[PDB]
Symmetry: D2
Subunit: 115 residues, 4 copies
């Protein structure tokens, strides 16, 4: 499992359940090509997006549908979504966890990178 996503709710103090997540890779003509997708579990986690052989060097984008989450809770949001864009595997293959912390008018994101 070379790529995982984990999401938390700063208003309720809980994992973020049933949030949609889409992954893209950058094409040669500089457009974004669809790569993988899913929804977060009861623990706020999304596993099994890709494999070691498929996840080659390149530039990748992860888009989290934060607007649809806040609307389901009846709370007004600022952002359309939360994004993360990064270059992968520049010094060999690694395991990547993308962690996000969500509020209606503010978010933070962090990468935890292992061998």
């Amino acid at each position: 499992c070379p790529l995982m996503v984990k999401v938390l709710d700063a208003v309720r103090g809980s994992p973020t359940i049933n949030v949609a997540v889409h992954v893209f890779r950058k094409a040669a003509d500089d457009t974004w090509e669809p790569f993988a997708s899913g929804k977060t579990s009861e623990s706020g986690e999304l596993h099994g997006l890709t494999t070691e052989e498929e996840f080659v060097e390149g530039i990748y984008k992860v888009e989290i549908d934060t607007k649809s989450y806040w609307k389901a809770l009846g709370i007004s949001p600022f952002h359309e979504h939360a994004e993360v864009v990064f270059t992968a595997n520049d010094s060999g293959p690694r395991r990547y966890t993308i962690a996000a912390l969500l509020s209606p008018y503010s978010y933070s994101t962090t990468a935890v990178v292992t061998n």
Copy 2:
């Protein structure tokens, strides 16, 4: 100003000068049209991007070139950029401050919205 951007360095506890910023709007055909651009000052702030009459209802994108900032200090960071996407002026005119806080492997972003 109806739109201002402010940027800080979380390693050094200091404003970030000379950081490039590009703004886009979503057009009727669902493509991103260039709207405004500039660089941050000595205080880490960028003013004067637009006017109340130009800044109508719509979906806007703010892209901050964080990778060039870290590379000039000798560091290879995780992110290519930081990008903030939002609907503006839906309930009438407002003033927007977009703040960003930077680390080599993390960033946060906050919006302050006021009615004049």
Copy 3:
């Protein structure tokens, strides 16, 4: 001012007014002595806490009453307060801004330090 405090609400995207703030210093016998206090203004800022001559070398504590803010809005939050502890003026006089960003179950804090 050599010391300023600024507070924001991450649910509403707005400055937080009327929030209580208390400052303490560490004395020679390792006990906390009261140093200064005040409340935030309409812009969410608190100025005028001390002077350059009073603000000597030492360890300082800034306590922000976040629980009273949330309770007045009908909310029972996780934290009792937010408390920031730091050594000041070790390498000569500097100016300090202590910022805090608030949610019911989370808070962040940042220091901006400048030389005049």
Copy 4:
């Protein structure tokens, strides 16, 4: 396991290893009384601090020694430590995870609270 602590490094993109952590409970005369302590693992986590029968209602403090971590890495820090103070079990017993994200001049903390 009613109480757990998890810590991450925003400069290096890694869990925070071998950071000291102390826990206190508030006494009747308003002083802080020592309660438990330990160090973070290779995954940045600290388990086994207390039990369900010992962890009664009251006000608790968690202190993370962030200054000693940055000094070990040769990086100048702003804060003496990171603190978290909270009232526990007001509506019955819960499981609490205290999550912290660290930079030399800035930190964030969040509670994840389960049944």
